[PDB]
Design a protein around this nucleic acid. Structure first.
Ligand SMILES: *C(=O)[C@@H](N)CCCC[NH3+]
Ligand SMILES: [Mg+2]
Ligand SMILES: [Mg+2]
Ligand SMILES: [Mg+2]
Ligand SMILES: [Mg+2]
Ligand SMILES: [Mg+2]
Ligand SMILES: [Mg+2]
Ligand SMILES: [Mg+2]
Ligand SMILES: [Mg+2]
Ligand SMILES: [Mg+2]
Ligand SMILES: [Mg+2]
Ligand SMILES: [Mg+2]
Ligand SMILES: [Mg+2]
Ligand SMILES: [Mg+2]
Ligand SMILES: [Mg+2]
Ligand SMILES: [Mg+2]
Ligand SMILES: [Mg+2]
Ligand SMILES: [Mg+2]
Ligand SMILES: [Mg+2]
Ligand SMILES: [Mg+2]
Ligand SMILES: [Mg+2]
Ligand SMILES: [Mg+2]
Ligand SMILES: [Mg+2]
Ligand SMILES: [Mg+2]
Ligand SMILES: [Mg+2]
Ligand SMILES: [Mg+2]
Ligand SMILES: [Mg+2]
Ligand SMILES: [Mg+2]
Ligand SMILES: [Mg+2]
Ligand SMILES: [Mg+2]
Ligand SMILES: [Mg+2]
Ligand SMILES: [Mg+2]
Ligand SMILES: [Mg+2]
Ligand SMILES: [Mg+2]
Ligand SMILES: [Mg+2]
Ligand SMILES: [Mg+2]
Ligand SMILES: [Mg+2]
Ligand SMILES: [Mg+2]
Ligand SMILES: [Mg+2]
Ligand SMILES: [Mg+2]
Ligand SMILES: [Mg+2]
Ligand SMILES: [Mg+2]
Ligand SMILES: [Mg+2]
Ligand SMILES: [Mg+2]
Ligand SMILES: [Mg+2]
Ligand SMILES: [Mg+2]
Ligand SMILES: [Mg+2]
Ligand SMILES: [Mg+2]
Ligand SMILES: [Mg+2]
Ligand SMILES: [Mg+2]
Ligand SMILES: [Mg+2]
Ligand SMILES: [Mg+2]
Ligand SMILES: [Mg+2]
Ligand SMILES: [Mg+2]
Length: 232
RNA sequence: UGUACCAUUUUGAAUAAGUGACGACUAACUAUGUGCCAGCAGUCGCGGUAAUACAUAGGUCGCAAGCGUUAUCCGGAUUUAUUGGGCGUAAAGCAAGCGCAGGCGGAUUGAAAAGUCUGGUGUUAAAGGCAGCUGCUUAACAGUUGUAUGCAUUGGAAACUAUUAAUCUAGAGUGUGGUAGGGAGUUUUGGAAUUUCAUGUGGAGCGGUGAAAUGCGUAGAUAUAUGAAGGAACACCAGUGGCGAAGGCGAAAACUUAGGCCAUUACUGACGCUUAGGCUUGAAAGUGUGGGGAGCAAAUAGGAUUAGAUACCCUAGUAGUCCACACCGUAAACGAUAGAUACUAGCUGUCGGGGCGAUCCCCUCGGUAGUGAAGUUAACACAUUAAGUAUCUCGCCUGGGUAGUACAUUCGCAAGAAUGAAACUCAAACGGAAUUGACGGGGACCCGCACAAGUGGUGGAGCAUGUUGCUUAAUUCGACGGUACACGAAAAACCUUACCUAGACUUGACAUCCUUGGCAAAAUUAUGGAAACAUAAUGGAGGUUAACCGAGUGACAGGUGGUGCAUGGUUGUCGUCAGCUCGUGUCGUGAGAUGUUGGGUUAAGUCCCGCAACGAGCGCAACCCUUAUCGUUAGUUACAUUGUCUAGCGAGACUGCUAAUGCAAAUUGGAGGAAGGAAGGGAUGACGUCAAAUCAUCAUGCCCCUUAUGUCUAGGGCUGCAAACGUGCUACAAUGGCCAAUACAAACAGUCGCCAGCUUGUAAAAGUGAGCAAAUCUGUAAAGUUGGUCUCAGUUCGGAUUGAGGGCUGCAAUUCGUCCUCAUGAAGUCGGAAUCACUAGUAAUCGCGAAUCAGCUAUGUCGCGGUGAAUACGUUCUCG
RNA sequence: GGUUCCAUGGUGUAGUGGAUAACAUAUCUCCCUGUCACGGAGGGGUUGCGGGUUCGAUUCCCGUUGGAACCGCCA
RNA sequence: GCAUCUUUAGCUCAGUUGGUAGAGCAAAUGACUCUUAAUCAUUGGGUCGGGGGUUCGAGCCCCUCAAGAUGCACCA
RNA sequence: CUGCCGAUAAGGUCUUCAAAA
């Protein structure tokens, strides 16, 4: 049957919001809401070879702050800070010159156990004509070796160019979806294949959060260092 | 025959490549076209608008001066099985027996030598066959030498078979001695019971069924008691049994008669097994002649049931069922297993003879059963009574339908029996066994407003809204049992809008990429205008082009156009039901089984035990939110009748204690407690099913349009109307209508808004106008209490419809907004067959608020509080 | 050629001694079921043509059509 | 022979008794479905057998032909 | 505790593949 979004079921209890701002009026609540979606989509659609895991947005009456986590930030940084200037101009055109931006790339730790880049890698493999069975298994084994709990991958679509759509799942371990205390990270991606669209869904279990609180604490960014800059 | 061949003879790549296939068997794939059409096919099968199977093209593969197709023969085919198959459940053991000819057949001795083996000789024509060699440029081919097979004759071998001459008893029979039987035929005899009749008593039904009705009965039935007549069959005994070759045999007796078991110091001395043809017997039905006929009952008549009933039920009812003599010769005639012979673990019964002598029990020899290993089988299963290891003999089988049909023949009075095909057609078969599911008008157990017990409704009337159908220029599109129909749509006058009629536009209303400049787009005022749009004006923020304003410019933009049966995403449903699987191991040739099923306990695959299973994952449960009590922090904009109230943290409830019984989980009761055994509610919805819903939220493969299916605007339309259905509102009333006074909420919302008060107005509202960015100000609570009146009427019920006058929003209210006032006063007096929801603050009912919104007969949707019930005995029926 | 009968709903048939027309099937709407048949409720639909009598004709009278049933013989 | 009737889209038949034609099938088109069947809507399709005559006007009334079928004589 | 209880148009998907990591 149908299931409630795993990310959406855990918001406001154990998971913080990706955008944290309070608008002035119901007219300014819509502009500030579509614009941040454009920024997030920009980061995700293009600049994909970087493995951007999550982009957070922080806005005040007039000051915009962006916290961008990536696995390989060299591509964003570019050759002696070139590509970086380009993206700043991109961000300024979307929000406006009248405001103040404080974009912040922040390098990420433990990149494997994140459902976003795994789905992106999965989608790239399917688009690259890689056999589906082999592609998921290599991603599954590497993620488990990274030192996490069970992972559930559902890859539904016109499998292998077939005319009848199927779906292949591969769970390997305890994925307690009905439990609220668990840390389940979820992401979904659309692999654009020449024979249509492939939907990949990745459920990852990253332990149990036994410390009550609406997070305010990082998630799989702590193990190695996490810095770099571009801020003020 | 100037032929093969030869040569440094001239010229010169010049004179020369096709066919089949490409989904699998079977080496070799893509596009275009078509769209269950045209076509392909040796087999499985491809084609229903994304075809590697069709057509064309490109590529590739298999062959080659050949390649495919067709025809015929052999192999593969162990698929007529001598080598080399089978007959319990798949085709196939005759219904059984007596059996001649045929086949086979105990042991020992002698002879012969017909089979059998071997030596010599003759022959089995030449070509061909196989081996070697030679010759053609090697080969194909030609020649060359070698190379068997059988028959006859002759000379030996004597193990086995056959023949002959004899001996023996162990095979098989005979006799004596024990002995068990529903074995058969013929002739007599007996008692219950039914029916009819005769005689009494008696007095209204009997009979029959799911329920009844034909029928019988005051002419005295049913019933009761006695008697007589007659026919058929032989309760109990009677069986985890007996006899016979089979069919079959069960009251008692007599006569005749068949076979069998056990022990044999007796006798014959292979006389034995099987059996084509032949003969005998052979359930029931049926036939012919003559008797008999109580009961029952094919055919038949009537009454029921039924859409129909020539059937199941009931009441009658002939042939027949019975006997004697003649036929018929078929059955699931079954142990679905032909007969005979020898061998191969065991255990438990039961019957008969014999040995012992109370039975009972022990042993021996046989008959009849159950369980069971090796062994066999495709599996089920058989297993000393074989379907096991083997031999002999007979019968029978060779895919399914045609078909046990047709012709011919034999038998029969007759129906028919025996024997028994083919033409044609299919790729399989009402094939066999077993496995996983589904289903059952099959069982066992357990659940849910399912039934049951109640309450209030719906189907009847008026109105609102959605749908079907019809119409129209359009009535845009989708949803269509449960799981569509107050659904998408949380707002159709314009806009929305996707539709129709018209007036206008073409790299376009919007976008990027490119050569190139920016010294604008807006908005608004004029004129023509239905408005789109044009011609003229202030020429405009800014920042030198940032963004945009453009020119030039072709790739293109654009599509609510098709396909939810190509999809991604999201959702309904079973269902918040308790399920769905995996790893390792074990069993099974295999699909598969195990765990996951057994016993207890739950809402639960929840847990505990048992257990060839041991564990694990998803679901279940808990962690999350909210309501119920209290502690702590805080005290304004709450409270201020002083500790409410509001929201942060925490305590509290954990089967924690006790009693009962259970191994243990756990169930029930009690204690204390605000709360007791998921304390109430919410979020949370496994694998999957229905090719379930959506291309019209969005995204997207493919197809289609490209001065039009794209774009702008005005008007119309989505609001129609002979009709039908669904969901709601209002009612049909005194538990009420109207009027007056009046008490008690929670939640939510608010600066183009909430709007207090005041003034005007019969009122919707207008003007003035504070207060409130909000625990402060505003959004009148109604049912309810009291008083007056109506007095049961189509009314002081009910409000539809209609006419007029007003108010608000908005350019604009006619198509098509709602509110108020006045006027009128349809139907309707509790609603047919049949249906829906609900297990406590629930049903019922009364108001209040919010979302989308300028406004909206939203009576809709999402929320909040006021009052506040009835019933649950139980699973027989009903749905899942 | 002559004589008797009949003409009623969409189909098969009753009635009316002048004042009045029903039955069954069929048809329609609604329960019913996954659906349909069957079942349940309710709804609907009629005198061959003509011409006279009567206040009034399906009925009574005379003619005209169509369909049937009887006869048409003696030489 | 005679008297009588009939000839009507592709087929089977009503037309009405004079103002010039439909019904039911078949075909097609859509709708409808995965696609069909079925269903449903819609729909094109006529020398009223050939000529003559009457009439202002003939599928309609009267004649002659062409092709069939009826009832009356293969002399009672 | 034996009422009654009938039917359901045709053809169709779906396993691509282990060479292996
Ligand atoms: C019999 O029928 C006769 N009267 C008829 C003779 C006819 C001759 N033309
Ligand atoms: Mg071909
Ligand atoms: Mg082809
Ligand atoms: Mg062969
Ligand atoms: Mg052979
Ligand atoms: Mg065989
Ligand atoms: Mg057989
Ligand atoms: Mg036998
Ligand atoms: Mg037999
Ligand atoms: Mg014998
Ligand atoms: Mg003999
Ligand atoms: Mg020779
Ligand atoms: Mg030769
Ligand atoms: Mg007697
Ligand atoms: Mg008999
Ligand atoms: Mg009868
Ligand atoms: Mg009887
Ligand atoms: Mg008889
Ligand atoms: Mg037989
Ligand atoms: Mg056995
Ligand atoms: Mg045959
Ligand atoms: Mg035979
Ligand atoms: Mg058959
Ligand atoms: Mg089965
Ligand atoms: Mg009830
Ligand atoms: Mg109603
Ligand atoms: Mg009605
Ligand atoms: Mg519609
Ligand atoms: Mg649809
Ligand atoms: Mg549905
Ligand atoms: Mg409009
Ligand atoms: Mg300027
Ligand atoms: Mg410039
Ligand atoms: Mg499109
Ligand atoms: Mg679907
Ligand atoms: Mg077990
Ligand atoms: Mg168990
Ligand atoms: Mg839960
Ligand atoms: Mg569908
Ligand atoms: Mg309009
Ligand atoms: Mg509407
Ligand atoms: Mg309602
Ligand atoms: Mg009162
Ligand atoms: Mg105050
Ligand atoms: Mg009335
Ligand atoms: Mg009223
Ligand atoms: Mg109006
Ligand atoms: Mg009343
Ligand atoms: Mg309940
Ligand atoms: Mg009510
Ligand atoms: Mg209904
Ligand atoms: Mg005479
Ligand atoms: Mg369709
Ligand atoms: Mg019944």
């Amino acid at each position: 049957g149908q299931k409630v979004n795993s990310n959406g079921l855990r918001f406001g209890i154990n998971k913080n919001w990706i955008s944290r701002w309070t608008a002035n009026s119901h007219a300014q609540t819509a502009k500030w809401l579509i614009e941040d979606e454009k920024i997030r989509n920009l980061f995700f659609v293009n600049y994909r070879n970087a493995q951007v895991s999550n982009v957070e947005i922080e806005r005040t009456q007039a000051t915009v702050d962006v916290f961008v986590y990536a696995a390989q930030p060299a591509f964003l940084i570019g050759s002696e800070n070139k590509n970086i200037q380009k993206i700043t101009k991109q961000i300024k055109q979307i929000i406006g010159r009248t405001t103040n931006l404080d974009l912040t790339i922040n390098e990420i730790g433990s990149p494997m156990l994140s459902a976003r880049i795994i789905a992106r890698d999965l989608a790239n493999a399917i688009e690259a004509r890689v056999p589906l069975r082999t592609a998921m298994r290599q991603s599954l084994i590497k993620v488990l070796k990274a030192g996490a709990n069970g992972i559930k991958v559902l890859v539904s679509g016109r499998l292998n160019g077939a005319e009848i759509a199927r779906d292949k799942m591969y769970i390997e371990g305890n994925m307690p979806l009905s439990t609220l205390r668990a840390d389940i990270d979820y992401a979904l991606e659309k692999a654009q294949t020449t024979y249509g669209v492939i939907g990949v869904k990745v459920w990852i279990n990253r332990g149990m959060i036994y410390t009550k609180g609406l997070n305010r604490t990082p998630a799989h960014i702590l193990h190695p260092q996490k810095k770099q800059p571009n801020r003020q």
